[PDB]
Write an enzyme that holds these catalytic residues in place. Structure first.
Site, PDB file in Angstrom:
ATOM      1  N   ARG A 109       0.811  -1.192   0.000  1.00 26.17           N
ATOM      2  CA  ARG A 109       0.000   0.000   0.000  1.00 26.17           C
ATOM      3  C   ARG A 109       0.847   1.245   0.000  1.00 26.17           C
ATOM      4  O   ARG A 109       0.426   2.254  -0.540  1.00 26.17           O
ATOM      5  CB  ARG A 109      -0.977  -0.005   1.164  1.00 26.17           C
ATOM      6  CG  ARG A 109      -2.217  -0.797   0.861  1.00 26.17           C
ATOM      7  CD  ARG A 109      -3.171  -0.843   2.005  1.00 26.17           C
ATOM      8  NE  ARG A 109      -4.437  -1.412   1.567  1.00 26.17           N
ATOM      9  CZ  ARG A 109      -5.282  -2.048   2.354  1.00 26.17           C
ATOM     10  NH1 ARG A 109      -5.004  -2.205   3.640  1.00 26.17           N
ATOM     11  NH2 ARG A 109      -6.379  -2.579   1.838  1.00 26.17           N
ATOM     12  N   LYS A 165     -13.346  -9.059   9.238  1.00 20.58           N
ATOM     13  CA  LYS A 165     -14.171  -7.843   9.117  1.00 20.58           C
ATOM     14  C   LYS A 165     -15.572  -8.257   8.632  1.00 20.58           C
ATOM     15  O   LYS A 165     -16.248  -7.515   7.903  1.00 20.58           O
ATOM     16  CB  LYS A 165     -13.581  -6.857   8.102  1.00 20.58           C
ATOM     17  CG  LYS A 165     -12.208  -6.262   8.400  1.00 20.58           C
ATOM     18  CD  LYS A 165     -11.649  -5.724   7.075  1.00 20.58           C
ATOM     19  CE  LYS A 165     -10.314  -5.007   7.201  1.00 20.58           C
ATOM     20  NZ  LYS A 165     -10.486  -3.612   7.664  1.00 20.58           N
ATOM     21  N   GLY A 208      -5.175  -5.495   1.851  1.00 20.25           N
ATOM     22  CA  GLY A 208      -3.798  -5.542   2.320  1.00 20.25           C
ATOM     23  C   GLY A 208      -3.249  -6.944   2.486  1.00 20.25           C
ATOM     24  O   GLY A 208      -2.195  -7.277   1.926  1.00 20.25           O
ATOM     25  N   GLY A 231     -12.314  -3.937   0.830  1.00 23.64           N
ATOM     26  CA  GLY A 231     -13.708  -3.565   0.996  1.00 23.64           C
ATOM     27  C   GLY A 231     -14.076  -2.486  -0.006  1.00 23.64           C
ATOM     28  O   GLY A 231     -15.221  -2.385  -0.440  1.00 23.64           O
TER      29      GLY A 231
HETATM   30  N1  LIG Z   1     -10.768 -18.904   9.210  1.00 25.84           N
HETATM   31  C1  LIG Z   1     -10.279 -17.767   9.714  1.00 25.84           C
HETATM   32  N2  LIG Z   1     -10.348 -17.517  11.051  1.00 25.84           N
HETATM   33  C2  LIG Z   1      -9.855 -16.378  11.555  1.00 25.84           C
HETATM   34  N3  LIG Z   1      -9.298 -15.471  10.727  1.00 25.84           N
HETATM   35  C3  LIG Z   1      -9.205 -15.644   9.395  1.00 25.84           C
HETATM   36  C4  LIG Z   1      -9.713 -16.832   8.841  1.00 25.84           C
HETATM   37  N4  LIG Z   1      -9.497 -16.769   7.544  1.00 25.84           N
HETATM   38  C5  LIG Z   1      -8.892 -15.616   7.269  1.00 25.84           C
HETATM   39  N5  LIG Z   1      -8.710 -14.933   8.406  1.00 25.84           N
HETATM   40  C6  LIG Z   1      -8.051 -13.598   8.589  1.00 25.84           C
HETATM   41  O1  LIG Z   1      -8.675 -12.443   8.041  1.00 25.84           O
HETATM   42  C7  LIG Z   1      -7.609 -11.558   7.609  1.00 25.84           C
HETATM   43  C8  LIG Z   1      -7.666 -11.138   6.172  1.00 25.84           C
HETATM   44  O2  LIG Z   1      -8.993 -10.621   6.101  1.00 25.84           O
HETATM   45  P1  LIG Z   1      -9.255  -9.134   5.730  1.00 25.84           P
HETATM   46  O3  LIG Z   1      -8.533  -8.342   6.709  1.00 25.84           O
HETATM   47  O4  LIG Z   1     -10.670  -8.771   5.675  1.00 25.84           O
HETATM   48  O5  LIG Z   1      -8.505  -9.056   4.349  1.00 25.84           O
HETATM   49  P2  LIG Z   1      -7.973  -7.973   3.354  1.00 25.84           P
HETATM   50  O6  LIG Z   1      -7.043  -7.011   4.278  1.00 25.84           O
HETATM   51  O7  LIG Z   1      -7.275  -8.612   2.198  1.00 25.84           O
HETATM   52  O8  LIG Z   1      -9.146  -7.228   2.874  1.00 25.84           O
HETATM   53  C9  LIG Z   1      -6.302 -12.236   7.835  1.00 25.84           C
HETATM   54  O9  LIG Z   1      -5.566 -11.723   8.947  1.00 25.84           O
HETATM   55  C10 LIG Z   1      -6.703 -13.683   7.926  1.00 25.84           C
HETATM   56  O10 LIG Z   1      -5.829 -14.519   8.698  1.00 25.84           O
HETATM   57 MG   LIG Z   2      -6.737  -6.345   6.944  1.00 29.33          MG
END
Ligand SMILES: Nc1ncnc2c1ncn2[C@@H]1O[C@H](COP(=O)(O)OP(=O)(O)O)[C@@H](O)[C@H]1O
Ligand SMILES: [Mg+2]
Length: 415
Positions: free
Chosen positions: A35, A215, A372, A395
């Protein structure tokens, strides 16, 4: 369409730039600076044009503190709303390294007049996490403007390069340009908006939306408004558990939005009504605790044992997801399919990445990855380069499906 930095007079001007420096951090260290790297061009532009930069951004989702309560803290000499895990400090350091020049880090975004005033062309100042103050993200415009008034006093021209927070109608995103009376889009904003624009218009169908990560409460609310656009909706990560439980399966100790179960059910209804084939996990990879373990429990059902937490999608699920991605011509992915940071729970994430990267490379599958953590996973796998686009917005990239114009984009001077 919105005005670009290109149309702005930057020479000798203090440019307020709202960037998205919400990079993945672990133990106070940046684990992926995609980023930040993505924001380099806009900063290079202003520096090249003879201006100075006073950057504003947020990291994480700190609790925040009301501006009023700040004064007291400042008297103590502390930092209002400070949360060690959400300091932009490491980001200031990194940015300084990439830019090859000093970046002075102002520990408090609402108390940086001193540093700002001493700025000269060529200077770069990064303010502390704007989310350290609740007003940044207040729903009360009065509140947002209060804070924005102060920030706006920091510079002359405003430019937004934070596609990624463009869906956030906030103090730094929409409040400053409002109060400052100007705002153009940085190169990254332009880029993201353009790629999505050209792509969301005439998407090659079938169009599969793969959404995972965490999230859940916020991300789950974006799904309803994207059913009209998509043909397939693959759901992984933490997002899945709320859906599976709403369907009546055992979720164990898995992450779930207990207050969203009916919402999940209704969304599944609409999905059918809108001709969207939603697919959830068939099996899971679990463990008794959020810790990596060679050979963790892999279920047969969608049900998760009471003492376990599903941490990744199972092999059968990976197969169906990869298979359906193969049936598409467009793929938009946001959110790892599991806890990819741990090797045993990374298979799902890397499988989707592989399929998308491969699909694009071998069949023109138009692929978009966002977020991210998502960008990190793509980069770890090496599939990042093989995608059609890897967005700094997660998002944001998902909200954008609804068809609405992101408030952060909207607030900009459309010239
Ligand atoms: N089954 C799970 N249980 C808990 N956390 C998870 C699970 N699967 C994915 N995650 C977590 O959610 C996070 C990524 O999600 P998110 O933050 O919404 O993604 P991004 O930043 O790509 O938009 C990571 O830290 C990941 O480990
Ligand atoms: Mg994140």
């Amino acid at each position: 369409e919105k005005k670009s930095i290109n149309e702005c007079d930057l020479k000798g001007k203090k440019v307020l730039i709202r960037v998205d420096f919400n990079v993945p951090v672990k133990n106070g260290k940046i684990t992926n600076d995609y980023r930040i790297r993505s924001a380099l061009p806009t900063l290079k532009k202003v520096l090249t044009e003879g201006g100075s930069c006073v950057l504003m951004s947020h990291l994480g989702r700190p609790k925040g503190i009301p501006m009023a309560q700040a004064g007291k803290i400042r008297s103590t000499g502390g930092v209002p709303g400070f949360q060690q895990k959400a300091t932009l400090k490491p980001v200031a350091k990194r940015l300084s390294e990439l830019l090859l020049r000093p970046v002075t880090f102002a520990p408090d975004c609402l108390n940086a007049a001193d540093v700002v005033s001493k700025m000269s062309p060529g200077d770069v100042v990064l303010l502390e996490n704007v989310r350290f103050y609740k007003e940044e993200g207040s729903k009360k415009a009065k509140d947002r403007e209060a804070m924005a008034k102060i920030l706006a006093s920091y510079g002359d021209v405003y430019i937004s390069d934070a596609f990624g927070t463009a869906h956030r109608d906030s103090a730094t995103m929409t409040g400053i340009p409002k109060i400052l009376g100007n705002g153009a889009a940085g190169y990254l904003m332009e880029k993201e908006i353009s790629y999505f624009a050209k792509v969301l218009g005439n998407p090659p169908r079938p169009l599969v939306a793969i959404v995972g990560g965490a999230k859940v409460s916020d991300k789950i609310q974006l799904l309803d408004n994207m059913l009209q656009r998509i043909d397939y909706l693959l759901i992984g990560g933490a997002m899945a558990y709320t859906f599976l439980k709403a369907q009546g399966y055992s979720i164990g100790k898995s992450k779930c939005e207990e207050s969203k179960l009916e919402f999940a059910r209704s969304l599944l209804k609409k999905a059918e009504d809108r001709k969207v084939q939603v697919i959830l996990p068939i099996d899971h990879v679990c463990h008794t605790e959020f810790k990596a373990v060679d050979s963790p429990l892999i279920t047969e059902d969608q049900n998760i044992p009471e003492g376990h937490m599903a941490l990744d999608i199972g092999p059968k699920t990976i197969e169906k997801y990869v298979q359906t991605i193969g049936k598409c011509k467009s793929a938009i992915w946001n959110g790892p399919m599991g806890v990819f940071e741990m090797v045993p729970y990374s298979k799902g994430t890397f499988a989707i990445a592989k399929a998308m990267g491969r699909g694009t490379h071998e069949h023109g599958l138009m692929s978009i990855i966002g977020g991210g953590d998502s960008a990190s996973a793509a980069e770890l796998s090496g599939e990042a380069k093989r995608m059609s686009h890897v967005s700094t917005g997660g998002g944001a990239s998902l909200e954008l499906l609804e068809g609405k114009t992101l408030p952060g984009v909207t607030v900009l001077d459309d010239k």
